[PDB]
């Protein structure tokens, strides 16, 4: 049972009541490209659908909403709201009437039923909602055997909602953007249907073709959602496509949801990890790290931090990372507490014991370019620590105290250190003197008053962001 | 109760540092186990220390004393349920039931904590409770209950005003602070050394004078250092008893080189034997020597580690990696050198180093409101 | 131990005593901004509370 009937009857009609009944006020709110006040609310409740009960998580009687609502998908004279109220009163097919299950068997002619019924009077969120919400809340069944093509077929009628989206209603619909919100989400379900066993070969030239119909003319959030797809498939898939960005780099005019812009800067900064652009990556991956604070308590912020701080370890120096300790992280040993301990020590045997010992988890790293200059980061951490400590140091001290076997090898490390501008050392190449020294003029004569155009350029930028922020009401 | 079984938790700290022996376990494990119906001081160190061969004539006569004590609980609360007084059950049974927490396990949570906490309005009985989460934070060496007695305490910190016992809240909050690396609040909260003369939760008040001088010797800048530990009038007697403690302040204030380490050797020999300080005898004493090199290395500029190493003892290479880990430790900015050997100090943070933290905050916290500033539209 | 800003110079002679004590510009400003960040924290619960 008696507790399974009342709950989806309540929350389900609370969903489409505000969804259809409010989106009616949205598209009848003739200029609503930014309101969408039950579109984004509805997607907030669909992210709540994947947590909670679905359309019908086969809820112990028959799973009867699917043979209920998509039948008579017709928005005529407003007694069709009473057709949906008949679809409230018929929710006791599980309780009162003859229980008839039609999931995975009649769901394909049910997908034909928005075409089998009469004309959709320009409220496509209900119909593309009926093209996503049946089978994408059935991804949680996880068999993915002959229903890959079923969920894909629901996305084919979503592609019919692309035909009726950007191939119909040629006068300024502005539900096209909300269908780019829903369409982008079920493109992540193209990942969650295709990418379990194949790659999205349709959405290669249809990635760029949905980008083509979402380039300039009515583009909003399709740019960097299709570029999150473009950026995310093409990392496990082979690279140089991020160089295919580089001739046509177009980022948002205005930033989206801070989760999306956060993870987007995490994706492209994670490209600059393997591109080894160390200057921009620390601040855009710092920005991306701090910009996504909401996560599930078992992780994905430790995934974002773990796969974030590797090239930050490869900067040559690093701070001691973040500032908010996590114990399930400590159980999973994701970002290598012991290895960054081997970084701030000048150790090599326990260092390569971490390297050799944990290689099954270095598989979970997948970024083996870390070690090839990270052993070099051990030796540059050593010469940076000792050179930073001593005013003068010599090759007799460091060249065999750090067992570099010879003067000239340390003269090559200091050749690369002066080449990196790390030390202001000098080497007398006659007797074997590193006649190292420390430079002068640390005072605020010139350098901070030069820096104040960066500090105050930053400050005037936040002035103008505050002004443009004031421009909205 | 407080001080005998509190001292038996100090004997659990005697179980703590000598681990290789089981004789100083069993001697006053037995001597603490035979007195005053103490089931728990051989129960948790039955679980932790050496076991018992038998306990029939040894200690089951004391579970028989727990049976006599328990059957006169079964006299007392039934004699107190007839009476209608100040909740005679929970008072006349809060006494012997806090004593039950002295006998056995943490059942004095239910038969102490809420037992008078649900009854009283004065902070005396609940403050005895707070003192008992303190002492069970000395038995188990808690992290929880020595915060939860501050949690129950702040319900009655909002009203009060008292001389001894609320300054004892300042004391044991001090011990909670300096139980981990939190240092100045213990010293400042101990600094009213007058009002804490003798209550039945104290150890030696002279040892309280030692503990406030150990936590008060740093976090006290040199005018305040001489103003407290030297210019203090009434402190001069209770450090005049222990001369090496009096010598320790006078050796540090003399600013020599070797008596830093003779004196520091004395304070090392103390700073093993102190409970909830024996996890913390590294950073305290490098805090000592970073205070010493801080106060000693600032004034000279024609400084050389030859002239240092002459009067330290030997510091030719013996302070080399020491001061290299000190400059390399992030603090103590001077310039250690090759055999040219000139140590060069830094700014007093009048001009240059001050010009950082404004943008350290105006990037970070202002960037947090840059993100919340970007929570307008989506 | 004591001081009169008599900083050690082995090779000058004057053992130069000098200072610039009034720099209360950055003193009072930094002391304000430390409190200002606490005021912005005092606004953060209003900000994060009023939205969602």
């Amino acid at each position: 049972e008696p507790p399974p009937p009342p709950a989806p009857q309540d929350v389900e009609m609370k969903e489409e009541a505000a969804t259809g009944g409010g989106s009616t006020g949205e598209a009848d709110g003739k200029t609503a490209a930014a309101a969408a006040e039950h579109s984004q609310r509805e997607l907030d409740t669909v992210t709540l659908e994947d947590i909670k009960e679905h359309v019908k998580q086969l809820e112990k009687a028959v799973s009867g909403k699917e043979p209920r609502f998509v039948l008579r998908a017709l928005r005529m004279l407003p007694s069709t709201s009473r057709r949906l109220n008949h679809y409230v009163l018929y929710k006791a097919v599980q309780g009162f009437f003859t229980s008839n299950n039609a999931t995975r068997d009649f769901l394909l002619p049910f997908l034909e039923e928005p075409m089998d019924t009469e004309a959709d009077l320009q409220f496509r969120p209900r119909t593309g909602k009926a093209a996503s919400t049946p089978l994408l809340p059935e991804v949680e069944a996880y068999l993915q055997l002959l229903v890959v093509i079923f969920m894909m077929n629901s996305k084919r009628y979503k592609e019919a909602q692309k035909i009726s989206d950007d191939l119909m209603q040629k006068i300024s619909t502005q539900n096209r953007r909300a269908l780019d919100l829903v369409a982008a989400k079920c493109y992540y379900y193209h990942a969650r249907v295709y990418e379990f066993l194949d790659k999205l070969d349709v959405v290669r030239s249809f990635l760029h073709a949905r980008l083509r119909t979402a380039t300039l003319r009515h583009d909003a959030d399709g740019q960097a959602t299709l570029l999150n797809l473009l950026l995310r498939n093409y990392l496990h898939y082979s690279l140089y496509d991020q160089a295919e960005k580089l001739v046509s780099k177009s980022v948002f005019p205005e930033q989206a949801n801070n989760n999306e812009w956060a993870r987007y800067l995490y994706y492209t900064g994670r490209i600059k990890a393997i591109q080894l652009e160390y200057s921009e990556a620390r601040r855009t991956m710092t920005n991306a790290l701090r910009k996504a604070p909401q996560h599930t308590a078992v992780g994905f912020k430790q995934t974002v931090h773990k796969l974030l701080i590797v090239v930050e370890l490869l900067l040559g120096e690093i701070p001691d990372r973040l500032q908010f300790r996590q114990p399930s992280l400590k159980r999973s040993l994701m970002p290598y507490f012991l290895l960054t301990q081997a970084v701030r020590t000048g150790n090599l045997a326990k260092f390569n014991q971490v390297l050799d010992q944990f290689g099954e988890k270095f598989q979970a790293d997948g970024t083996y370019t870390l070690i090839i200059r990270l052993r070099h980061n051990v030796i540059k951490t050593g010469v940076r620590m000792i050179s930073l400590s001593y005013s003068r140091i010599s090759l007799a001290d460091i060249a065999q105290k750090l067992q570099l076997d010879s003067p000239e090898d340390a003269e090559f490390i200091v050749a690369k250190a002066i080449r990196d501008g790390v030390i202001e050392a000098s080497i007398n190449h006659e007797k074997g003197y590193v006649q190292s020294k420390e430079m002068i003029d640390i005072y605020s004569t010139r350098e901070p008053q030069l820096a104040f155009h960066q500090r105050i350029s930053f400050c005037l930028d936040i002035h103008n962001m505050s002004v443009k922020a004031m421009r909205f009401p | 109760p407080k001080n005998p079984d509190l001292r038996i938790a100090q004997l659990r700290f005697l179980l703590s540092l000598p681990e290789h022996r089981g004789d100083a376990a069993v001697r006053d494990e037995l001597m603490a186990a035979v007195r005053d119906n103490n089931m728990a001081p051989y129960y948790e160190a039955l679980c932790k220390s050496l076991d018992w061969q038998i306990d029939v004539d040894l200690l089951n006569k004391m579970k028989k004393a727990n049976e006599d004590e328990l059957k006169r609980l079964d006299e007392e609360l039934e004699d107190a349920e007839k009476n209608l007084g100040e909740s005679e059950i929970r008072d006349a049974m809060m006494a012997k039931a806090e004593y039950l927490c002295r006998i056995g396990d943490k059942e004095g949570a239910l038969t102490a904590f809420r037992k008078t906490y649900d009854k009283t309005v004065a902070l005396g009985h609940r403050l005895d409770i707070v003192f008992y989460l303190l002492r069970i934070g000395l038995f188990y060496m808690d992290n929880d209950l020595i915060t939860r007695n501050t949690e129950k305490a702040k319900s009655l910190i909002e009203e009060g005003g008292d001389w001894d016992r609320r300054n004892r809240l300042k004391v044991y909050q001090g011990l909670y602070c300096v139980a981990i690396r939190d240092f100045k609040q213990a010293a400042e909260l101990f600094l009213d050394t007058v009002s804490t003369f003798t209550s039945y939760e104290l150890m030696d008040y002279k040892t309280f004078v030692t503990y406030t001088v150990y936590v008060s010797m740093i976090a006290l800048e040199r005018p305040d250092l001489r103003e407290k530990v030297i210019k203090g009038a009434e402190i001069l007697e209770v450090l005049h008893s222990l001369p090496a403690v009096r010598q320790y302040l006078f050796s540090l204030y003399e600013c020599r080189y070797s008596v830093f380490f003779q004196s520091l050797a004395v304070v090392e020999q103390e700073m093993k034997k102190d409970w909830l300080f024996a996890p913390h005898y590294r950073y305290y004493v490098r805090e000592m020597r970073i205070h010493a090199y801080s106060q000693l290395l600032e004034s000279y500029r024609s400084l050389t580690l030859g002239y240092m190493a002459e009067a330290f003892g030997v510091g030719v290479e013996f302070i080399d990696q020491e001061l290299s880990r000190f400059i390399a430790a992030g603090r103590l900015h001077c310039k250690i050198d090759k055999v040219n050997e000139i140590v060069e100090t830094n700014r007093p943070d009048s001009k240059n180093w001050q010009y950082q933290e404004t943008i350290k905050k105006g990037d970070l916290l202002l960037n947090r409101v840059q993100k919340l500033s970007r929570v307008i539209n989506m | 131990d004591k001081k009169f800003h008599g900083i050690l110079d082995q090779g000058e002679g004057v053992l130069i005593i000098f200072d610039e004590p009034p720099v209360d510009k950055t003193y009072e400003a930094a002391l304000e901004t430390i409190q200002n960040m606490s005021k912005v924290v005092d606004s953060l619960y209003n900000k994060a509370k009023k939205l969602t």
Binding site: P448, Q449, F452, R455, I456, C459, L460, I462, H463, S466, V467, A469, M470, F472, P473 | Y355, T358, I359, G362, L366, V369, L372, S373, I376 | K25, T26, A29, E32, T33, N36, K39, V40, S43, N46, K47, K50, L51
Partner: peptide
């Protein structure tokens, strides 16, 4: 120095009431 410190505090002037009155007028419009 006065431009650096003081104009950073000018940012600290505009930002607070600009954000607070901004989202008051934004999400209290309806």
């Amino acid at each position: 120095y006065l431009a650096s410190l003081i104009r950073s505090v000018v940012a600290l002037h505009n930002l607070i009431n600009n954000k607070i009155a901004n989202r008051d007028a934004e999400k209290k419009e309806g």
